[PDB]
Ligand binder design. Structure first.
Ligand SMILES: N[C@@H](CCC(=O)N[C@@H](CS)C(=O)NCC(=O)O)C(=O)O
Ligand SMILES: N[C@@H](CCC(=O)N[C@@H](CS)C(=O)NCC(=O)O)C(=O)O
Lengths: 220, 220
């Protein structure tokens, strides 16, 4: 049976998994979990993930939660080689470090900005949020000593990072002159034949939605 | 070959996560102090070593690994007599990986959102939204603890990551017993480890106390 992803295209971690599936040549059956209408808080979803977050993978009855765990699981089970997630302990350590940089820094700080606008009716992006996000950009820039986030080769860590960066750059400005490594890295990822469908459109659209929601919230 | 070297500060939660892991693996760590409180992490030589200027950093005979979760996985992978602390079964490992990213993306990130502004930016308050964010993280952890440990019936590195953070934040944003019976029973299990207090418990308590003292010093 097909792999099932419980998902929403606007969600960055969902798009990270979509990029990974495209890279692996996997077809995902996508089941919408609409966060705006509280689909993730329904008992039938909470049973799949006590943390009530998307994405969640159902692989023939086996439930895997959390985008990074899902990506590692998919590469491990379905990869024809380990290029996207190395088995070598030292190469893997660099990828693992970057995956946690994404969850702990990039995504967390994006969510600290977006959640309150999308779900709590806020009409601002406080100075401290802006500062945190700008610092996350600096940290990513300084991490990009090689062409990709975890070395000379593209890995799942790049998919995680771009899913988030492509979303927040539309809201908290990512100054081109100050982040040449990030922009050059974005250009590399944009060369992927599946980049637009798996990530680019949804990242751009999430940023636009946050800006629209901020305006709506300011008015009422 | 050389003893493992950790650039570290006992007060730091991710450093204590690594300390717990080394104790569990029966490994000696040569600790080199990087005092964040005096800006040691920003000296040119350390930044060259870790462009993100965070601790912990492992030096294993010239191999440099940043990021506590990556360090823990590397240590178990290379030096574990068995893989109990970080399983190789894809599904069991996915459960651990999911919990590790919950720790970095939720528990740790929200603790840092509370602590950093006090410890380093001269702030003297804990905004209500920070308290709520942290309380939510406790609820998410409680709901994740369906088994004896965070990622299943066996203690793993995910437990060490989680407790290092929980033991720190609970002294500032109270983690109330009636609401979190699973967390308290889990803490009791970890407290049965002979090395728990030394590797983690006291340091977590001390960080919470230091945050409260700094908050008061920062006032007016
Ligand atoms: N570390 C998780 C983060 C998942 C996450 O926070 N997803 C958001 C959507 S972007 C969500 O489901 N939020 C709903 C909630 O937290 O209740 C992952 O990468 O899968
Ligand atoms: N995900 C990282 C977090 C590391 C981290 O943020 N450590 C803090 C101390 S708790 C630090 O070094 N802060 C200094 C800085 O970010 O400049 C890990 O687990 O190693």
């Amino acid at each position: 049976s097909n792999l099932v992803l419980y998902t929403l295209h606007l969600s960055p971690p969902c798009r990270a998994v979509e990029l990974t599936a495209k890279a692996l040549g996997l077809e995902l059956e996508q089941k919408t979990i609409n966060l705006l209408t509280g689909d993730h808080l329904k008992p039938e979803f909470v049973k799949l993930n006590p943390q009530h977050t998307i994405p969640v993978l159902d692989d023939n009855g086996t439930i895997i939660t959390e985008s990074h765990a899902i990506m590692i699981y998919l590469v491990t089970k379905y990869g024809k080689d380990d290029s996207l997630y190395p088995k070598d302990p030292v190469k893997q350590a660099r990828v693992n470090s970057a995956l946690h940089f994404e969850s702990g820094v990039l995504f967390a700080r994006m969510r600290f900005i977006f959640e309150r606008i999308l779900f709590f009716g806020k009409s601002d992006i406080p100075e401290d949020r802006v500062e945190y996000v700008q610092k996350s950009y600096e940290l990513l820039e300084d991490t990009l000593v090689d062409d990709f986030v975890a070395g000379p080769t593209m890995t799942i860590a790049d998919f995680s990072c771009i899913s988030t960066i492509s979303s927040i750059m539309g809201v908290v400005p990512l100054e081109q002159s100050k982040h040449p490594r990030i922009y050059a890295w974005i250009d590399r990822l944009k060369q992927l034949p599946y980049y637009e469908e798996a990530n680019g459109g949804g990242g751009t659209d999430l940023g636009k939605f946050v800006l629209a929601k901020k305006e709506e919230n300011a008015k009422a």
